[PDB]
C-alpha cells in the first residue's frame, strides 16, 4: 500500500455545470463550453464558469455601476457583460450609450439602457458579435453586500452584528457590550 | 470515579491534519498600536504628498 500524501478520491470542488435546471441556461452552457474548448480566448472560460455560479455569487450589477465602469479611461465604447440580472438605479440622472450583454435585464433597467439610446443583448447574441469576446468589459456585482455576511465571523471583538430577531435596547445591548455592564464585546 | 487527568496524546496528530497554517503575510500591515503622535503627523504628511501629486497631473 502507499503512504498517501493527499486525500484520495478528492472531488475538485468547483461546479462543473450550472446546478439550475433551466433549459435555456443549459443551452447557453453548450454554446460556451463549445466556444471555450475551441477558441483559446480567456473571456470564454470566465463566462462559462460564471454561468454555473449560484444566485449568491451572482449579485446584480446595477445600471449605475455599469455607467461608472464606462467612465474608465478608454472604456466608454466597450460592451459590458453581466452574467446575471442587471438592475435599474434612479440615483444616476444620466446614463451613457453602450451595449449590455446579460442574463437578465429588469423592467426598469433595459428601459433606462434603451431610453439612453442603447441596446440590450442576451448572452448568445454577444457570442455572435464577439466570439473571442473582443472589446468586452465584464462586471461583477458586489458579493459581500449580502446581508448574511454581516453575521459571519461573529465573536468577541469582531464587531460583526448579532444574529438577532428583534432589535432595540432590551435586545442584546447590556452586559458584555458596555464598560459599565460587566465588560465590552 | 477517578478518571484520566490530562494528556496531549493525539494533538500534534490533529494539529497536522489541516496542519499548522503558515502565519499569512500582508504588504501594508496594520498600524495597530503604533505611537499616536507618530500617526497624527503621518496622517498630515500623507495628506501632503497626496496633494503634491494631484497638483502634478494639473
Amino acid at each position: 500500500g502507499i503512504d498517501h500524501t493527499s486525500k484520495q478520491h478528492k472531488r475538485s470542488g468547483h461546479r462543473t455545470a450550472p446546478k439550475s435546471d433551466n433549459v435555456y441556461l443549459k443551452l447557453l452552457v453548450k454554446l460556451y463550453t463549445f466556444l471555450a474548448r475551441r477558441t483559446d480566448a480567456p473571456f470564454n472560460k470566465v463566462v462559462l464558469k460564471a454561468l454555473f455560479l449560484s444566485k449568491i455569487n451572482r449579485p446584480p450589477v446595477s445600471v449605475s455601476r455599469i455607467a461608472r465602469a464606462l467612465k474608465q479611461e478608454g472604456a466608454a465604447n466597450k460592451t459590458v457583460v453581466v452574467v446575471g440580472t442587471v438592475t435599474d438605479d434612479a440615483r444616476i440622472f444620466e446614463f451613457p450609450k453602450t451595449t449590455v450583454a446579460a442574463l437578465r435585464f429588469t423592467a426598469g433597467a433595459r428601459a433606462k439602457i434603451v431610453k439612453a439610446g442603447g441596446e440590450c443583448i442576451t448572452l448568445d447574441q454577444l457570442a455572435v458579435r464577439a466570439p473571442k469576446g473582443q472589446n468586452t468589459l465584464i462586471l461583477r456585482g458586489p458579493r459581500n453586500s449580502r446581508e448574511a455576511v454581516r453575521h459571519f465571523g461573529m465573536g468577541p471583538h469582531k464587531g460583526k452584528a448579532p444574529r438577532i430577531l428583534s432589535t432595540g435596547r432590551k435586545f442584546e445591548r447590556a452586559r458584555g457590550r458596555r464598560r459599565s455592564k460587566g465588560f465590552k464585546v | 470515579a477517578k478518571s484520566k487527568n490530562h494528556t496531549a496524546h493525539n494533538q500534534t496528530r490533529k494539529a497536522h491534519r489541516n496542519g499548522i497554517k503558515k502565519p499569512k503575510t500582508y504588504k501594508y500591515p496594520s498600524l495597530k498600536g503604533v505611537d499616536p503622535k507618530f500617526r497624527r503627523n503621518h496622517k498630515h504628511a500623507l495628506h501632503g504628498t497626496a496633494k503634491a501629486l494631484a497638483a502634478a497631473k494639473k
Binding site: - | 490533529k14 494539529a15 497536522h16 491534519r17 489541516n18 496542519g19 499548522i20 497554517k21 503558515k22 502565519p23 499569512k24 500591515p29 495597530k32 498600536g33 503604533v34 505611537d35 507618530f38
Partner: protein, 159 residues
C-alpha cells in the same frame, strides 16, 4: 494547588550570566532601532520593567513601533494549529539586532559585485549557494609518509 505565574520556571532563564551582573553597559542604549529591524528577544534579569514574557525568550520578531524607552516587536505565536500575531512592548535592554540577516545582506551587496563585475566582463556568473559537494579525485602520496599499521590492543585495568 499548582502555581503558574508570569515569571514562574524562569529561575535560570532570567538569571544573569556569570560575573556579569551590575548595571548594563551603555552601548545597549546607544544602539538605534527603526521600524523593520529584526531583533532577538532575551529578558534582562536586572531591568524589571518592560520585560518580555518568558515565552518570547530566544524568539526573534520585527519592530513595528519605536517609542521613548521601548520598541514594539511583533512575534508570531503558534497557538493551536495556526499562528497568531502578538505585538510586544519591550524595553531596549531586552531587544537586540539579529545578525540572522547580516549574512544575507553581506551576500546581497556581494551578489551585486559579482553580477556587475561579470556582466561588464562578458557574462557567466553563477551566484546561487550550493550544498557541500563530495570530494574529488586525489593522489595521496607515500613519500616521507609510509602507512603505519595499527592493531587493536588487549585489555588492561590501571586502577
Amino acid at each position: 494547588g499548582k502555581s503558574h505565574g508570569y515569571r514562574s520556571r524562569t529561575r535560570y532563564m532570567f538569571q544573569r550570566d556569570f560575573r556579569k551582573h551590575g548595571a548594563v553597559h551603555l552601548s545597549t542604549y546607544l544602539k538605534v532601532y527603526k521600524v523593520g529591524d529584526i531583533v532577538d528577544i532575551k529578558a534582562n534579569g536586572s531591568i524589571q520593567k518592560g520585560m518580555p514574557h518568558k515565552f518570547y525568550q530566544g524568539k526573534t520578531g520585527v519592530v513595528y513601533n519605536v517609542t521613548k524607552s521601548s520598541v514594539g516587536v511583533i512575534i508570531n505565536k503558534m497557538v493551536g494549529n495556526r499562528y497568531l500575531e502578538k505585538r510586544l512592548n519591550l524595553r531596549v535592554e531586552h531587544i537586540k539586532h539579529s545578525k540572522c540577516r547580516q549574512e544575507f545582506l553581506e551576500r546581497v551587496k556581494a551578489n551585486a559585485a559579482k553580477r556587475a563585475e561579470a556582466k561588464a566582463q562578458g557574462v557567466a556568473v553563477q551566484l546561487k549557494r550550493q550544498p557541500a559537494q563530495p570530494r574529488e579525485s586525489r593522489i595521496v602520496s607515500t613519500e616521507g609518509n609510509v602507512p603505519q599499521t595499527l592493531a587493536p590492543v588487549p585489555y588492561e585495568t590501571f586502577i
